[PDB]
């Protein structure tokens, strides 16, 4: 084949997966391009990495991403992560290191976790309340 | 309206039988060379700055 | 034809809970001082190479009001 | 609160008591040492232990430690 790597990004249940092949600078998510996405208020969340590290950067690669699970926001943070980690995976193998450290350094400076996936997760409700911490309601008498 | 800037130094402890109140010593940096102890309402760490509204009256304990 | 039964005199009954439970049953039911019964069982168990053993008797015995005893020797752990 | 229990502290003592030539303010090697030199059932207790024998060790370099 050609130069190409696969990476991912996860935020809660959602798991966004990237295939970053060598190519002519596209970036499509699930099936459509990246200049659509929606939530769209959020839109700039996922444009972000490409700005962070300069819009060029991608003209030697094509990027595909497919999100599954998690809700409308869960996915948009998940995807942007897999995009940035996908850049850094490529320059890990196919470019030099000092570029890969150049990239990682400007992601880690701005960062919404972006390279690292966030540990946060729903805590188990326990019997006695509608929630995890939440208790019910007592009245004594 | 003579405002008075004072740099907090050394967190000395909580007062008020409630507990909300905290005792600190300050340092106006509009000429240091002098220091004073105040009561804060909110959360405080060393190197904060308090708008003392009366440069000349300090408070001790709370019940 | 499609099923079969087998007897298998288990290896040392002294470390079978069930064996000793049914023992104490058939002890007291055969008329035996409660202390004698239990303390007996704990002695056969311990002697049978146990690390430790424990016996509770709850219930009402000759008196009207219900009491309950413990009867433990040696080592036990209780958690996890 | 990460106050280390006695079994952690006790085992740690005896390990330094008789294996100071060996062990060295690196949790990693003191870990592997413990596998060889000591019997422990769980991985966590093993770390928890080595982690403290490495503590004790790391400050003995600066004076004695009572016990």
């Amino acid at each position: 084949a050609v130069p190409s790597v696969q990476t991912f990004g996860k935020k809660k249940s959602a798991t966004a997966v990237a295939h970053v092949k060598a190519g002519k600078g596209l970036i499509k998510v699930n099936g459509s391009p990246i200049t659509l996405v929606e939530p769209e208020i959020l839109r700039f969340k996922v444009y972000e990495p490409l700005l962070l590290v300069g819009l060029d950067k991608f003209s030697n690669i094509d990027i595909r991403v497919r999100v599954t699970g998690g809700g409308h926001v869960s996915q948009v943070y998940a995807i942007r992560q897999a995009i940035a980690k996908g850049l850094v995976a490529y320059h890990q193998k196919y470019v030099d290191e000092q570029s890969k450290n150049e990239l990682k350094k400007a992601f880690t400076s701005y960062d919404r976790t972006l390279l690292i996936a966030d540990s946060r997760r729903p805590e188990p409700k326990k019997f006695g309340g509608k929630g995890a911490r939440s208790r019910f309601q007592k009245s004594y008498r | 309206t003579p405002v008075t800037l004072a740099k907090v130094i050394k967190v000395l402890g909580r007062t008020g039988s409630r507990g909300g109140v905290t005792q600190v010593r300050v340092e106006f940096l509009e000429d240091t060379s002098r220091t004073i102890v105040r009561n804060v309402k909110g959360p405080v760490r060393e190197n904060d700055i308090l708008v003392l509204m009366e440069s000349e009256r300090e408070a001790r304990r709370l019940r | 034809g499609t099923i079969v039964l087998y007897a298998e005199r288990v290896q040392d009954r002294g470390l079978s809970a069930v064996a000793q439970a049914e023992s104490m049953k058939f002890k007291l039911l055969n008329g035996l001082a409660i202390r004698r019964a239990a303390y007996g069982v704990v002695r056969y168990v311990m002697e049978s190479g146990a690390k430790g053993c424990e016996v509770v008797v709850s219930g009402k015995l000759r008196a009207a009001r219900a009491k309950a005893m413990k009867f433990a020797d040696g080592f036990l752990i209780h958690s996890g | 609160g990460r106050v280390r229990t006695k079994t952690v502290k006790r085992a740690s003592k005896a390990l330094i008591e008789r294996y100071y030539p060996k062990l060295t303010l690196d949790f990693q090697t003191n870990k592997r040492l413990c596998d060889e030199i000591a019997t422990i059932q769980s991985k966590r207790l093993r770390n928890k232990i080595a982690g403290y024998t490495t503590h004790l060790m790391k400050r003995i370099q600066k004076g004695p430690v009572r016990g």
Partner: protein, 55 residues
């Protein structure tokens, strides 16, 4: 029967609504005994010979 039922006055919301409510509606739990829970009523007691042969 049903003919009796609607013909019958003394019945239906109108009336009840214009009747005073007893004060026992608003009574508490009555409780009766709990401050006596620990002193046996049997008046009998066991003994110590029957207890000691027992245990």
């Amino acid at each position: 029967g049903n003919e009796g039922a609607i013909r019958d006055k003394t019945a239906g919301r109108r009336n009840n609504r214009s009747k005073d409510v007893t004060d026992s509606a608003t009574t508490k739990k009555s409780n009766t005994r709990r401050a006596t829970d620990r002193h046996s009523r049997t008046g009998k007691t066991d003994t110590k010979k029957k207890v000691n042969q027992g245990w």
